[PDB]
């Protein structure tokens, strides 16, 4: 149908909460967390059988007083494509996630 | 139609042109990530292909902090591709990614 | 009389520890302040983050960075001074 | 039962510290051992790095991670538990 920012934002927050919700930075589980986050969102997004290609990226930075800066733009169909970037943080982690939906 | 060696070269150049030879400076980094994104995006769009591009750039101040990124897609494996580049100097880490999708 | 019970630090740094402790003991009577004096010297001359416990009766189980630990008695008083950023 | 003297820790985590200390006393007699049970218990459930000092006579001066510090009395001993590292 079409890229619905509100839904996508829900899927992200959800995924984030599951994977890292209530944990502390640990290089141990980090690789697997960030991985599960993208995989979950992707699992959900695709399941809706919509006519879209999706791109999901996630990054977790160990909160530690370090400066972090990101930027993103696209060259696509500003009429049928969309994106949502969610910021999430807790005691020890800075987490950013993005999902880009590009029409068929 | 998406050549990874091509884009990788563009990315690296864009990184060098923008932050190559400078040190982390809070109120200058925001300008830098944006340039790297515009730089890469400008070069990629000239060759007006029936492709869509997504470009993300991030710069973290080296401070012994941990950083992990992950990404994946649901696209056409036969046409769409991507290139992620790790980069770093004395004061900062940089990660740039480009994704290409046809149609 | 100084008695180094359990130590893991530069021979020089150990001495440095005992010295500072002695001075502390003859500037303050309250253990709490004794600790403070010591902990502050090491955060200054050896970078943060140091922790000190000064008492006559106590048990502990702490974690520390290599080469930055020492548990020596100075008279009847026991001093625990370790680093753990 | 317990008396929280000074603290910077959530309520549930505080309760947890008391609970853990309560049991530690039921299984050990020497101060150094009570600490270990506590220190190890926290490291597991709330993540490294924790430090515990148990005693009847001691002063302290330590630096800690926000929301991770507590000093209380229980039984015949004082208990200092804090995260740093």
């Amino acid at each position: 149908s079409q890229f619905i920012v509100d839904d996508v934002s829900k899927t992200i927050k959800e995924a984030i909460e599951t994977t890292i919700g209530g944990n502390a930075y640990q290089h141990d589980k980090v690789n697997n967390w960030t991985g599960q986050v993208v995989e979950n969102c992707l699992t959900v997004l695709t399941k809706e059988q919509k006519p879209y290609k999706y791109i999901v990226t996630a990054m977790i930075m160990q909160k530690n007083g370090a400066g972090l800066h990101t930027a993103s733009s696209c060259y696509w169909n500003n009429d049928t494509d969309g994106s949502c970037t969610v910021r999430w943080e807790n005691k020890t982690m800075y987490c950013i996630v993005s999902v880009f939906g590009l029409a068929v | 139609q998406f050549i990874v060696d091509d884009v990788s070269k563009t990315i690296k150049e864009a990184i060098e042109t923008t932050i190559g030879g400078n040190a982390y400076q809070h109120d200058k980094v925001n300008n830098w990530t944006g340039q790297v994104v515009e730089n890469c995006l400008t070069v990629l769009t000239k060759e007006q292909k029936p492709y869509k591009y997504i470009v993300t750039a991030m710069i973290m101040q080296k401070n012994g902090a941990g950083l992990h990124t992950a990404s994946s897609c649901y696209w056409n494996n036969d046409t769409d591709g991507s290139c992620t580049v790790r980069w770093e100097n004395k004061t900062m880490y940089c990660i740039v990614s480009v994704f290409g999708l046809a149609v | 009389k100084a008695v180094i019970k359990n130590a893991d630090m530069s021979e020089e740094m150990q001495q440095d520890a005992v010295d500072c402790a002695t001075q502390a003991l003859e500037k303050y009577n309250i253990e709490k302040d004794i600790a403070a004096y010591i902990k502050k010297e090491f955060d200054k001359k050896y970078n943060p983050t140091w922790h000190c416990i000064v008492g006559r009766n106590f048990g502990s189980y702490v974690t520390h960075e290599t080469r930055h630990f020492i548990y020596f008695y100075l008279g009847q008083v026991a001093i625990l001074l370790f680093k753990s950023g | 039962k317990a008396v929280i003297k000074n603290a910077d820790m959530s309520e549930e985590m505080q309760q947890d510290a008391v609970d853990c200390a309560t049991q530690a006393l039921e299984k050990y007699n020497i101060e150094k051992d009570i600490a270990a049970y506590i220190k190890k218990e926290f490291d597991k459930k709330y993540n490294p790095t924790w430090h515990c000092i148990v005693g009847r006579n001691f002063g302290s001066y330590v630096t800690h991670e926000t929301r991770h510090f507590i000093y209380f009395y229980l039984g015949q001993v004082a208990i200092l538990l804090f995260k740093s590292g």
Partner: peptide, 27 residues
């Protein structure tokens, strides 16, 4: 037609320090 791709991952580990856990006890 459409399928998933690899999971590209980057890793910049935190600096580590060698540590120890000691115990003390007054006599």
């Amino acid at each position: 037609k459409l399928g998933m791709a690899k999971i590209t991952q980057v890793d910049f580990p935190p600096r580590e320090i060698v540590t120890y856990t000691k115990e003390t006890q007054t006599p």
